[PDB]
């Protein structure tokens, strides 16, 4: 996600697994969050696919209902041949939102 600069990608050797996308983010690009012209399929490394992490969403982490795709611009720029797009950082925004949601109810 380009909106949040603090997010860090896994950036490892992609395996043969297939990424998944939930209903909240269905047609978004895994890199630039675009909405036009899906091009290729997203692969992830075996570390991101083990036990409870199998079938989870790539960006946020919800249940997987659709496959992840690269847009045409990312394919032209060859940004897909980098690694798995799975985000390993939990994110300071989500935990903080949960923290001031829990106290208020």
């Amino acid at each position: 996600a380009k909106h949040h600069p603090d997010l860090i990608f896994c950036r490892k050797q992609a395996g043969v697994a297939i990424g998944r996308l939930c209903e909240k983010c269905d047609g978004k690009c895994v890199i630039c969050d675009s909405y036009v012209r899906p091009c290729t399929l997203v692969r992830i490394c075996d570390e991101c696919n083990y036990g409870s992490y199998q079938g989870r969403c790539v960006i946020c982490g919800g249940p997987g209902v659709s496959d992840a795709y690269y847009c045409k611009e990312c394919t032209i720029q060859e940004k897909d041949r980098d690694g798995c797009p799975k985000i390993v950082n939990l994110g300071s925004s989500k935990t903080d939102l949960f923290y001031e949601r829990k106290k208020y109810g």
Partner: protein
């Protein structure tokens, strides 16, 4: 910090990169490019009367330390 592509990759420079390092890196890249292609190798082996194996062996030797000794 989305600069992971620059640090992990080999050959990328920075402010404290000397001229010798850049020159030797580009020389090694040029040698690899010469080795990869076939028509360039044919041109090199036709310009001087040698064989493809001999040219490849010489290119292997020239990759140890080009541009002379460092300063």
């Amino acid at each position: 910090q989305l600069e992971h592509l620059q640090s992990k990759y080999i050959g990328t420079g920075h402010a404290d990169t000397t001229k010798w390092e850049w020159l030797v890196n580009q020389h090694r890249d040029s040698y690899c490019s010469y080795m990869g292609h076939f028509d360039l190798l044919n041109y090199f082996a036709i310009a001087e009367n040698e064989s493809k194996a001999r040219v490849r062996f010489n290119l292997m030797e020239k990759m140890l330390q080009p541009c002379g000794p460092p300063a």
